[PDB]
Design a protein around this ligand. Structure first.
Ligand SMILES: */C=C/C1=C(C)C(=O)N/C1=C\C1=NC(=C\c2[nH]c(/C=C3/NC(=O)C(C=C)=C3C)c(C)c2CCC(=O)O)/C(CCC(=O)O)=C1C
Ligand SMILES: */C=C/C1=C(C)C(=O)N/C1=C\C1=NC(=C\c2[nH]c(/C=C3/NC(=O)C(C=C)=C3C)c(C)c2CCC(=O)O)/C(CCC(=O)O)=C1C
Lengths: 503, 503
């Protein structure tokens, strides 16, 4: 099995896990076009007999009694001689689908509606930090659901994923700082998770039981189960979970204005069950997290812009206090250095180029200054990778991964190189998984050990992107209160001319 | 209309409204303490004879069968021969209470909770800022209730009332931007509003039926009903609610980190009944609005401050471009006004006074510059009421009600000042509904006048308080960010004179 997954569609496997039982109705007859293989236990007749019979006869009276209310709402309690069963309606490909789920034996009088929502929303009374908000949400989710581990992901612009918050019981390895490639999650999976809020993987050991028409004749395709919540997982992802060691999963999809921002993944080692009320409350909890994250991301970006301005401001205090600027940058290296979130600065101002922080060598920076002139840059230049644009520094990686340049003078070549380290260097290596387990897995698919490589070779020779705040600060320092720099140059020159006349 | 209102104890009034009935119990013997006058219809036997009787025969057998069940939830729906009835239990004064309320005929099986919650949440998908958050929330709450006029109230630091947004159908009076003094909400009422989220006005027309006995013997005062949601309101508020003509109200409280930031008070001209599914939905909606309101408030700042810091930047571009400071302010007189959110600005860099915007004449400016030097302020002087701090300028405070002054020179007396207009002038006088009412009110207890008239005299010689961002910008103006850029003009002039007369 090679090159599998992305080619394979995931909405048309035609398989159902043994958790529930589904049937397909169509037309006034509501014929049993598609039936399950496990319906023998509940219906009491062989599935092939069920085929080609009217829905009124086949359905037990318990389900038929509240069928109108079931269509009105889509969820109500029906008690069978075996026991009570959750019932739902979902329309796919023009055919209605009746879904039956084994409800718990609990009387359900306890854990009433809307009180779990209060229990979940109470701890979030504070929650300043976006990362700390995700941490608190993970804590509450773990407290309610009882799963071993809760992890929260953020998706990068190119759909690279990382882990932000992690709430877990003591004992298992921490997964904070994880980075996994965008290709780990296929496009169709992202679309499906966008469409439906919750995904439940009841048990990994369970062998899927397929519905038993081979192919739908009228459609020519297996029945689509995208809306249905009983979709069977892909075998590749099943082996993923088997290698990782998690068997029951409960995944929540965080959406910011229709964009899949990240996922909450509740993981447990053994198959567990969750009540219907808890899941219904968790859907609302997902909506709350979506809204709160949508607001707080804007809050954090505004705060970062304000801090960038309030950091660029004091730089005018040093230059203007009397001390020469070339000594001033050495005096105040940190503030000028962190105006863009970069690690190296190099300045051309008329004299020999000056270096602050980790910067490329003298020959390298002068060659870069020579090379930058022919390209017409109206105000500034933004680049993500330097190897493609500039061959000579492609070999250099540790001080040549990122570049940001602004020309201080419109005519004269005044170059302000800003180098930001490679994404793999700026991110703490404490974020890697490490902790090598003794058993040897396939090492190609599973995340433990045999992963995090695709990230490092996909983003190799690439630095973290220059945010809107980063380029705004780049322009601001292209000025750097351009009055102070231009007027100190002019003032020094015009005092020097008077001194030379006095000379 | 007697003996004012502040001394009146709301907590201890112990009144029972028209619809529901109450009865108290003590200990395992559950001695009956108090009864309502209207319970005889529901109980079927005279209330006076049951004083101190056992619950076995006073109360119908069905409630006693569900007493242990009612204790768990604290509220339950039960079928009674008269009809469905809804009962509650809670603790007050060491004495347990049983409350009975008329019940809606719906068995709470159709359109249950946790599916209208998403109906309320979905419109909030946008709401880029606080104002539209409140607008959308008010609109959707109005849609849920079906009431006539929803309203939102905001309180200042000194508890003065604001009206941010409202949603109304066509054909009534609007009070957007209308103002009410802090004393309109008694200090007794604020703590109670903090304690419980929801309070419902059952019927304004119906007089409060008395509670029997008139007073409990053991305590000497009627038992309080803070936990109860049926507690009757003051007779003083009956005249108010009659004057505005509303019949029922449904008060929703918005608390941020334990403080009454806002208050939602729906109004309906005629009586209307709301089910507890809706009530338990809107209490969740208040808990909802709390967090998102905090988030949007916290996001609004650090963006206004960022814009002010960025706004100060082009003032530097006014320099370097050919011209002096006088000419720089001549072309750019607009931008310097919003640097501190003040309509007038004055500067004194050593020469004759120069003014921008509507500021006091130069003689009083010189007088205040002379007077501020004896007053010890190291970096800035932020006074909200000028007359209290400085008598002579109290006479003309239309534009000099509030001032922010900074010393340009470190030791010498060089000043930069900003003058804000007095309040009421800045606010949009839209609080008047126009259309003087054909009925004649007392002009002291109604929406227009009485309220917003005591408020105006309460905030005479007052301006919006100097926040953090405007003073930060003001101190940045004097700080070595643009002040040094101003100083460099002196060195440029010095080099010009060095070139002058010597060539
Ligand atoms: C060629 C594509 C795939 C290779 C790569 C592979 O191993 N699986 C592929 C496709 C699918 N991924 C599905 C679900 C899924 N996989 C991940 C990957 C992870 N990266 C990590 O660090 C961790 C945790 C340690 C994981 C699990 C994720 C995040 C997901 C989303 C759901 C989940 O978290 O389990 C998948 C099934 C569809 C779906 O459930 O979305 C296919 C097919
Ligand atoms: C000190 C006595 C009072 C006079 C003064 C008065 O006008 N109100 C007094 C005390 C109480 N006010 C109560 C309710 C209430 N009052 C307001 C303020 C307003 N100012 C206005 O101009 C308008 C008209 C639009 C109003 C409504 C508000 C906002 C409220 C709460 C709204 C509500 O009833 O839900 C009151 C009873 C408290 C209660 O149970 O609500 C007292 C006592």
């Amino acid at each position: 099995e090679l090159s599998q997954c992305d080619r394979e569609p995931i909405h048309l496997l035609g398989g159902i896990q043994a958790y529930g039982v589904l049937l397909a109705f169509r037309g006034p007859d509501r014929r049993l076009e598609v039936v399950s293989a496990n319906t023998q236990a509940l219906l009491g007749r062989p599935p092939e007999a069920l085929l080609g019979k009217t829905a009124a006869q086949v359905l037990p009276a318990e389900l038929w009694a509240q069928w109108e209310l079931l269509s009105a709402r889509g969820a109500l309690r029906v008690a069978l001689p075996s026991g009570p069963y959750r019932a739902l309606l979902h329309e796919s490909d023009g055919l209605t689908v009746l879904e039956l789920e084994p409800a718990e034996l609990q009387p359900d009088m306890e854990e009433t509606a809307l009180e779990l929502v209060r229990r979940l929303v109470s701890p979030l009374a504070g929650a300043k930090g976006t990362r700390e908000l995700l941490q608190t949400a993970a804590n509450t989710v773990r407290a309610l659901t009882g799963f071993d581990r809760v992890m929260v992901y953020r998706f990068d612009a190119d759909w690279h994923g990382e882990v932000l918050a992690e709430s877990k019981r003591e004992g298992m390895d921490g997964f904070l700082g994880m980075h996994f490639p965008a290709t780990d999650i296929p496009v169709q999976a992202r679309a499906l998770y966008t469409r439906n809020p919750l995904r439940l993987i009841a048990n990994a050991r369970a062998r899927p039981v397929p519905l038993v028409p081979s192919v739908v004749p009228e459609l020519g395709r297996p029945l689509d189960l995208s809306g249905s919540a009983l979709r069977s997982v892909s075998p590749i992802h099943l082996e993923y979970l088997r290698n990782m060691g998690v068997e029951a999963s409960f995944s929540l999809s965080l959406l910011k204005d229709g964009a899949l921002w990240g996922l909450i993944a509740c993981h447990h080692l053994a198959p567990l069950h969750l009540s219907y009320e808890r899941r219904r409350a968790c859907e609302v909890l997902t909506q709350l997290l979506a809204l709160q994250l949508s607001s707080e991301e804007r809050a954090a970006e505004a705060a970062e812009d304000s801090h960038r301005a309030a950091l660029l401001g004091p730089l005018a205090t040093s230059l203007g206090a009397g001390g020469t600027l070339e000594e001033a940058l050495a005096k105040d290296g940190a503030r000028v250095l962190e105006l863009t979130g970069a690690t190296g600065a190099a300045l051309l101002l008329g004299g020999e180029p000056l270096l602050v922080g980790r910067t490329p060598s003298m020959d390298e920076v002068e060659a870069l200054a020579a090379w930058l002139a022919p390209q017409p840059f109206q105000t500034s230049f933004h680049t993500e990778r330097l190897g493609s644009l500039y061959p000579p520094l492609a070999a250099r990686a540790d001080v040549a991964a990122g570049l940001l340049a602004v020309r201080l003078a419109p005519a004269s070549s005044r170059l302000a190189l800003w180098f930001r380290p490679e994404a793999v260097r700026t991110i703490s290596w404490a974020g890697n998984p490490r902790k090598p387990a003794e058993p040897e897995p396939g090492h190609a698919r599973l995340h433990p050990r045999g992963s995090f490589q695709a990230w490092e070779e996909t983003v190799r020779e690439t630095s973290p992107a220059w945010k809107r705040a980063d380029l705004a600060a780049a322009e601001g320092f292209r000025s750097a209160l351009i009055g102070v720099v231009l007027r100190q140059a002019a003032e020094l020159e015009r005092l020097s001319e008077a001194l030379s006349r006095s000379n």
